[PDB]
Amino acid sequence: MVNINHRIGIKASPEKIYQALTTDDGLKKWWTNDISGAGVVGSTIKFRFNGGGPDFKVTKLIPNKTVCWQHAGNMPESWMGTEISFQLETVENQTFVRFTHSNWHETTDFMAHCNTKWAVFLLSLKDALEIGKG
Amino acid sequence: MVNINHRIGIKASPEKIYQALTTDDGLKKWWTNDISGAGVVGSTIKFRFNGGGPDFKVTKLIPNKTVCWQHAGNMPESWMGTEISFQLETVENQTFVRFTHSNWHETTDFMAHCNTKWAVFLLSLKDALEIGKG
Secondary structure, eight states: OEEEEEEEEESSOHHHHHHHTTSHHHHHHHTOSEEEOOOOTTOEEEEEOTTTOOEEEEEEEOTTSOEEEEEESSOOHHHHTOEEEEEEEEETTEEEEEEEEEEEOSOOHHHHHHHHHHHHHHHHHHHHHHTOOO | OEEEEEEEEESSOHHHHHHHTTSHHHHHHHTOSEEEOOOOTTOEEEEEOTTTOOEEEEEEEOTTSOEEEEEESSOOHHHHTOEEEEEEEEETTEEEEEEEEEEEOSOOHHHHHHHHHHHHHHHHHHHHHHTOOO
16 A cells, blocks of 8 residues: 655654653644643544544554554544554654654545645644744 | 655745746745756756755746656666656646656655655745745
8 A cells, every 4th residue: 555754853852752742732732723632542632623633543652752543533444544653763963753654545635635734744843842933 | 656746735826836946046045045057948957955956857848837857967777767747736816736756666765755855845835935934
């Protein structure tokens, strides 16, 4: 199947990136305004915004490193079986981010749309953590 | 083979986007500082920056719409045979951008790196044209 890979260096502690993306306080700055959940493996993280707030079920948590989750909701099976991985690795004086959004059937409209969006959110994650522009 | 697709809406005339990416004055604001060429089909556009300024040979030009080019230089054949397409289509009160960077052999490090970068440059293209933040 087709997968989407993004990569970005961020000058911030793996702890900062991890917590930011595993807490409501961090996520409400990153993704959107209305966000609930942000619990542990087995639980569901609820995102809400105008257009279609996604729901993400937590499948794996590694302290200050790798986080992985699977899409949840009433979407077609192909979307329900979609998994997403977020890996961290410390490089020199910064933390290198490796994001993977996998499980694509074919080159549909959603693919390119999400592909671009993901990198923009990463850029925001970078500037927010490094400077505080977010 | 593997290809990379990005998509972004920009509230600006197809003429503005076209010219910006076909003139030195526009490119020197978009991509990097030191840029030369920006000629017609058959010619080579020269980008220069610290890390590896690319050279892009123009293969097709459509007025205020589709621009396509092919990588040039002393890179391996797989890179020399790499082509890139930039399509425009007017949607409602704005212009919709469709960017394709194709000709990837395998999921190497360069793939994810370029993938993320492309979306960032598009975002910059958007804010510059709409507001003037660039």
